[PDB]
Amino acid sequence: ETTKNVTIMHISTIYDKTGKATNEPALRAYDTVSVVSDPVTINNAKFYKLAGKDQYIKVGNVDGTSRTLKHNSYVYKSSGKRANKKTLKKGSSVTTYGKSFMIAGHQMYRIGKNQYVKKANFL
């Protein structure tokens, strides 16, 4: 196997070679793991194979998904405070990692370490 090191950006279920979830302990955000460098496709979904193991994680939890903003947006911390006073502008492409989180009552995507943007603001 040719492998590379990646940072988990979102809690990640461990799947088997058929894309079925296992009960193996989930990988946790900001841990580093060795994966086979090229993703695999299972059921038209992309996964990283963990190096040396028949275990697979979703690429969206590592490389993310590029999404376009339909509204000007603030960036929040998990506490609910604004992370900064910057505004991400409508039409910007922003990478989001995994499934949205509930932050201060709103569904939000993680865009960075302790940085979140409201899901409703994306196209």
UniProtKB/TrEMBL annotation:
Q: Where is the S-layer protein C-terminal domain?
A: 2-59, 60-119
Name the source's superkingdom: Bacteria
Which protein is depicted? S-layer
**Organism listed in the record:** Lactobacillus amylovorus (strain GRL 1112)
Range within the parent protein: 335 to 456 of 456
